[PDB]
Amino acid sequence: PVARSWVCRKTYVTPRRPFEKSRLDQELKLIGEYGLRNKREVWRVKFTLAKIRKAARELLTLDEKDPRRLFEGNALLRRLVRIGVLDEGKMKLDYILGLKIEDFLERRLQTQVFKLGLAKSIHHARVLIRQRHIRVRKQVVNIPSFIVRLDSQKHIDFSLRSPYGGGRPGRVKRKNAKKG
Amino acid sequence: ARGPKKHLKRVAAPKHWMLDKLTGVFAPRPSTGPHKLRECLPLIIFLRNRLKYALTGDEVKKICMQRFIKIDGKVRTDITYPAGFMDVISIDKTGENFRLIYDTKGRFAVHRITPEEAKYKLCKVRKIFVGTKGIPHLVTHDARTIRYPDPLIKVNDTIQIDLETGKITDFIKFDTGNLCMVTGGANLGRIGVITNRERHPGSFDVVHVKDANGNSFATRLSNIFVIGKGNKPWISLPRGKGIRLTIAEERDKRLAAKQSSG
RNA sequence: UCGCUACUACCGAUUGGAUGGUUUAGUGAGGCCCUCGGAUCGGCCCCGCCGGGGUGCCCUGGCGGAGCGCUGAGAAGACGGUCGAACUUGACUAUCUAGAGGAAGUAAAAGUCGUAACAAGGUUUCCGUAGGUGAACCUGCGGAAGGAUCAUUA
RNA sequence: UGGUGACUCUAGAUAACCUCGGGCCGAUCGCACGCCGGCGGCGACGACCCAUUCGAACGUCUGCCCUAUCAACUUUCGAUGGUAGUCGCCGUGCCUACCAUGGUGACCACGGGUGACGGGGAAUCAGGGUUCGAUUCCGGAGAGGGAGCCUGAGAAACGGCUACCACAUCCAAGGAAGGCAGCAGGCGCGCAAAUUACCCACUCCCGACCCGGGGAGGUAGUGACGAAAAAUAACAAUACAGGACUCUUUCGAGGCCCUGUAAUUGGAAUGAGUCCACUUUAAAUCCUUUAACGAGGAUCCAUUGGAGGGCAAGUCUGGUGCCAGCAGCCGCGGUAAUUCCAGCUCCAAUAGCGUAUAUUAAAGUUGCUGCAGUUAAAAAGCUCGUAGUUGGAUCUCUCUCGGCCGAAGCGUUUACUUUGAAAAAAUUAGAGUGUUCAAAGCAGGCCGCCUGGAUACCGCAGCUAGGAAUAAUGGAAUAGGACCGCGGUUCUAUUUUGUUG
RNA sequence: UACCUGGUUGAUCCUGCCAGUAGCAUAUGCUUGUCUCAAAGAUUAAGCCAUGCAUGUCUAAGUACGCACGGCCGGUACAGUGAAACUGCGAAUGGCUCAUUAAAUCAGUUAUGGUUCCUUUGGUCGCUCGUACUUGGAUAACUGUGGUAAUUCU
């Protein structure tokens, strides 16, 4: 007996066929377009989409005046509007099935740092997040796959201790000032 | 085993105590007392977990050992004393008074009450027997035996106990049209009017109850506690009035109640 | 059909030894229950040396002694009962273990005599069943076509 | 008197008993002190009996893997039942005496096996399924193997005792003491598994107890079991016999957008480390927060398998020459090897990747959904036949009471279907919540208040209520049939005669 | 994400199996910078165990004549703190493992109207017509004398 929880969960699935061209090609295009590191970051966002399609595909067999479909189905669309993947006029339960991987990958903090212009490339956003230069509303966020909600998109900035926004220079500029 | 168990694991605790997973292996293990250990709230959970007065299971010892806590008007120096339904907790150093009533979701509740109401409690009659040179007795759900009862008290009714003397003042009988609270099952903590009582001889009576909104439900007879004569409760009720909201309108209450902010 | 090297397993003498499981019979540690037993420890008596109180007699304090006195407590030990571990010897087995002999299949074999079969495969083939051999096999009986005929003339 | 659905219940009355191995009816401790020699107030220990709580025990119904090279078993010696008792906390062949001769079996008993503790659950999965579940929660069992007890509310107890069988420690040889399937640790076994560490601060438990104790439990150490996040570089200016956009018929004209086998230049950014301090904690560590140092082949270098096809990616070069070896399969190697040994280059996953074995999908190659049976593996030589399985049409709620609305009855009994209530938590699904994201967690939020800690699922069996299609089943055929009022025979209610026989 | 692909022939269409493929779990190889959780002597031997620890306990309120401390005041029964020992209570829980065990365990469902229950909580506790302003004997701790090679022996 222990006071520990052993409840864990894997967050990706690997494909059934390992060496398949045009699966390899499409995921490499999605790695290069969004600045991701390995295939497992695509297989992770493929997995949260496959959980959302599957739960909506279950809710589509119950009729329109079901209790469970009306409650749990309105709570599924609410999250997808909240993270900015769906829009507001498309809140029937059948524009869930028209979602794709790219809608979910456009909402990462990495691509949003690139979209707002705080970076100048999609790989420049990965480092600027990871070097702790990026904060969201007060809080330095150190994770590039931080899915930016819709209300937290207007507050993404440059982290008041950083040499980019705050002003105290880094390791390199101060040593060159010492050698001045 | 050989002889009785003295420990309670945490996951094996009652669900309504709302103990989290990661604080320990063991749960407080109520002492034997008036209430079943599945039907009670120990005094350590009322002080540390609900009221946030204490912070550890040693401060509950330091609070109870100053004799600051009266459960039904008698001072209790056991931190795992099982307080149950309709039990009055008088803390006189601060000035509060609580009654343990279920709320609409199957748990207990912090129900602060006025010290003018804290002089009495209701009990439910459980067995009535004569004996010992023909002297009649009650047995209530607190194991309180009150000899010489009123002859019109029968089984499944409700008495009203005076807590300073121990004597019955007036009672309610089991009838239709009486206001009842469900004290067990999946309709627990719900308040409604008795509609109907179906008899099943050799099995359990089923008592159909009707809400104040129209929501009918049924229980077995043993999960039925007559609170009021007619529709007027002889005790106070919690913030919700014993009326269970479905989860859709329970969501609507939150998403409309946040819009009063600013 | 007929020549080299090794393994698997069984038979395998040896009435070879060691250990389990079921029971036949005999034995039966220790506990408990019963019937006894009575090492010891008190108590109440009875006298003797004697005080006080009450009135020769009663109650008290110190002791002492004796009696197979008469009661209480009670250890060892025994009879019998029961529970039952275990032991001894049989039978049924099962398993760990030493030993000549031979046995079968397996690893290949590109070693020798025919050419059974696939063509009408030079005796159409195949099936059952009995008999005989160097052997593929051959032959007697009765089928089948998966035949070499879907047919043979009033 | 009071009760239940039903008592041989609960109470009442009467006659007696009441165990010397005795049944209760208090020779007990504390704190403040008193009121008129008595009368006292709060507690602490007790205490027969009753109730309750915590249980335990013994039962009811339904359910489990493989095997027929296990088809009859049980019954002297209890097997099934009856009567009377003994024992036991009590119900019972539990056991004893006397009887009766029964009890279970293709609807698979009985016997054997299990690499069998059972569940909650776990893996995989379209739907159906299949396999695992020693393992932290519930329940069982057991402390080397059987057996017997003491004490106690509770034990057939092993961190209690007594034996025996098996091991084994000391010994002065007469004796004495043992039981890690507790936490550590050791040996052995094996493919196969961590420290003889710190602390009662947390969660709780025990005790006379606000105080003591706890290898329960917590904290560290070992730990690529496994799961979550995630570095190993970004940017700019040049140049290219690089590409793309506007013009020139074309040469060729440009900061307009991209790219690099530029070990071209250039500062700007930063962790990993090194390390004061705070914070964390019982005290420490770790992470979080901060000084100072900390990157140009940013040598502070990323690996594991592969390049014939399945299957992403070189008939490049050197070596060997059916050798060495590769290769899951097909195949490769006999002097030009797309396959071996290597160099280069390229590919896949990436702080991870190969191999072996178990298992699941693929497997419609176990098939209920959903396979096959002329010739590919396969229809019994033929027929009869009991069990099993399957079976043609047909049939459109009322009586005695209480305030028209409830009781009570049904009707022949069910299967089916729908609702209800009861179904441990954790897991699973799912709601809410910016753990810095996430896996998680059950928290949190606002300027003392406001919250949450939902909900679904929970087969079969058993309760409940509505439906009446389908499917089984009854209801009178020698009418001892329905409904009526008529008569007889036997028993008999309890009111009726101011009470009283 | 309800999926297939190579292998029988000179070529073909099939039956059909081999082989690949993807999880998941035990081992193992090579490699391994950061950070958060986290399993871990189950499988074979329910094999064997050095050493140490894992079960003890006092309030105002059962028993204090230990000077072991100190403290009034010295005729002051007992100031106090208190080891020890007697008494009470616990040690039957928790922890570990999975050998047994196949209508057994167990799960759901009922029953005790067929039973016991320390404790807790409530009841009851002058309900009996018959030395007390306080009863009797021991025993530890302590003092003192010993035995045994040896024990939590006495």
Side-chain angles (χ1 to χ4, degrees):
Chain A
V2 281
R4 298 166 179 158
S5 93
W6 319 288
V7 39
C8 60
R9 173 182 303 254
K10 205 185 265 188
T11 52
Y12 72 103
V13 190
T14 76
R16 280 184 194 107
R17 299 164 163 250
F19 305 116
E20 169 174 277
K21 203 84 183 303
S22 272
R23 189 204 95 231
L24 291 171
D25 272 329
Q26 177 217 351
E27 281 166 339
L28 189 52
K29 291 199 185 201
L30 275 149
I31 278 172
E33 183 182 354
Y34 291 112
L36 318 170
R37 175 182 39 182
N38 49 11
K39 285 289 216 288
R40 211 209 286 117
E41 301 199 352
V42 186
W43 300 342
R44 176 170 78 208
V45 188
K46 270 187 196 175
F47 192 36
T48 83
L49 176 83
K51 276 171 176 157
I52 288 168
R53 297 191 91 255
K54 175 254 302 174
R57 211 175 62 203
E58 179 265 333
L59 287 166
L60 281 184
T61 64
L62 319 176
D63 49 345
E64 283 89 353
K65 296 169 295 191
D66 214 85
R68 174 172 207 251
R69 183 190 193 266
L70 281 171
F71 182 83
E72 183 184 328
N74 276 352
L76 181 53
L77 298 150
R78 199 195 73 87
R79 313 199 273 94
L80 295 180
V81 178
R82 188 193 193 202
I83 59 182
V85 170
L86 273 172
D87 60 83
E88 298 256 14
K90 275 197 165 192
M91 273 195 283
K92 294 187 203 168
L93 204 59
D94 284 355
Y95 311 113
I96 289 189
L97 300 191
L99 296 177
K100 283 209 69 180
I101 306 300
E102 300 98 27
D103 269 333
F104 282 79
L105 280 161
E106 285 265 328
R107 299 314 298 166
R108 300 169 91 233
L109 183 50
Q110 177 176 1
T111 87
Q112 284 302 311
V113 159
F114 181 46
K115 280 319 168 198
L116 267 69
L118 314 177
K120 47 212 309 181
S121 196
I122 200 60
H123 309 273
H124 190 41
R126 188 97 172 197
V127 291
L128 284 190
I129 289 173
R130 202 54 188 145
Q131 314 296 356
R132 315 153 96 250
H133 296 298
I134 294 296
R135 68 170 159 89
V136 182
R137 301 203 225 199
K138 206 52 73 184
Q139 164 92 34
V140 178
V141 186
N142 205 27
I143 277 90
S145 71
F146 175 98
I147 282 172
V148 177
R149 287 176 179 139
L150 215 48
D151 48 70
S152 43
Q153 196 179 343
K154 283 97 202 175
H155 321 270
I156 291 176
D157 275 315
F158 259 116
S159 159
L160 309 161
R161 286 288 303 246
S162 71
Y164 280 65
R168 180 201 140 94
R171 208 211 296 185
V172 192
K173 183 168 260 180
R174 291 188 285 105
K175 198 215 268 199
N176 286 22
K178 290 312 164 310
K179 286 170 178 40
Chain B
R2 322 171 258 159
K5 285 160 285 212
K6 299 200 260 279
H7 296 254
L8 191 76
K9 295 287 178 62
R10 202 169 187 93
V11 185
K15 174 100 164 84
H16 64 266
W17 294 358
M18 296 176 298
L19 306 184
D20 59 346
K21 288 213 296 187
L22 261 50
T23 318
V25 182
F26 305 97
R29 188 52 194 218
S31 303
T32 50
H35 298 277
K36 303 272 210 180
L37 80 87
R38 293 268 131 178
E39 284 276 321
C40 76
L41 189 84
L43 190 59
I44 178 167
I45 297 178
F46 196 64
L47 296 180
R48 179 183 65 207
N49 289 258
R50 295 300 107 85
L51 284 188
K52 323 287 214 312
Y53 274 137
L55 289 185
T56 47
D58 175 47
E59 305 190 43
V60 180
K61 189 87 175 166
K62 278 186 179 176
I63 288 161
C64 298
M65 271 294 139
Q66 295 151 341
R67 307 183 63 88
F68 278 159
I69 284 156
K70 308 178 61 179
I71 291 174
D72 285 2
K74 315 195 77 145
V75 158
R76 288 314 175 192
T77 37
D78 189 7
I79 75 182
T80 50
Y81 181 87
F85 189 45
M86 316 288 298
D87 279 13
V88 188
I89 312 167
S90 296
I91 289 162
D92 271 6
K93 181 57 71 177
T94 67
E96 303 146 291
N97 278 80
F98 310 97
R99 176 173 260 116
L100 286 183
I101 308 168
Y102 291 109
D103 62 344
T104 63
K105 271 167 180 166
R107 327 187 274 256
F108 279 113
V110 188
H111 181 39
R112 308 194 186 266
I113 208 59
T114 313
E116 273 75 48
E117 198 197 302
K119 293 186 181 297
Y120 73 95
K121 68 171 282 186
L122 314 176
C123 316
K124 158 166 169 155
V125 195
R126 268 207 183 151
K127 59 173 291 153
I128 293 181
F129 58 98
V130 312
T132 77
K133 301 185 171 178
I135 303 175
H137 298 72
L138 296 195
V139 166
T140 69
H141 75 290
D142 318 329
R144 290 189 162 254
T145 167
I146 306 109
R147 54 180 214 156
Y148 297 122
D150 217 353
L152 307 187
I153 309 174
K154 305 299 174 209
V155 182
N156 316 313
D157 307 311
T158 299
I159 67 183
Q160 174 184 328
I161 278 291
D162 187 19
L163 266 178
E164 199 259 12
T165 80
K167 280 90 166 180
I168 311 177
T169 63
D170 58 337
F171 59 91
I172 316 174
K173 216 187 261 209
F174 195 93
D175 285 303
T176 57
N178 282 146
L179 187 69
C180 77
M181 174 165 265
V182 172
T183 83
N187 309 314
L188 158 70
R190 293 181 92 188
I191 286 166
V193 194
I194 288 181
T195 297
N196 190 43
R197 187 260 292 269
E198 201 153 36
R199 294 216 163 184
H200 295 115
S203 314
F204 315 103
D205 289 12
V206 182
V207 185
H208 298 90
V209 189
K210 165 134 194 170
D211 213 348
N213 278 106
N215 287 255
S216 275
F217 51 93
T219 56
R220 286 179 184 192
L221 172 69
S222 70
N223 302 311
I224 281 296
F225 205 102
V226 191
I227 275 191
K229 174 78 209 75
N231 297 322
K232 274 81 59 178
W234 280 15
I235 51 158
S236 317
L237 302 186
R239 183 168 29 185
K241 289 300 191 175
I243 296 185
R244 171 181 285 165
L245 287 182
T246 76
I247 40 182
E249 53 188 358
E250 201 177 289
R251 153 200 85 198
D252 285 18
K253 193 200 181 73
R254 287 170 193 163
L255 290 166
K258 281 162 57 79
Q259 310 294 326
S260 76
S261 63

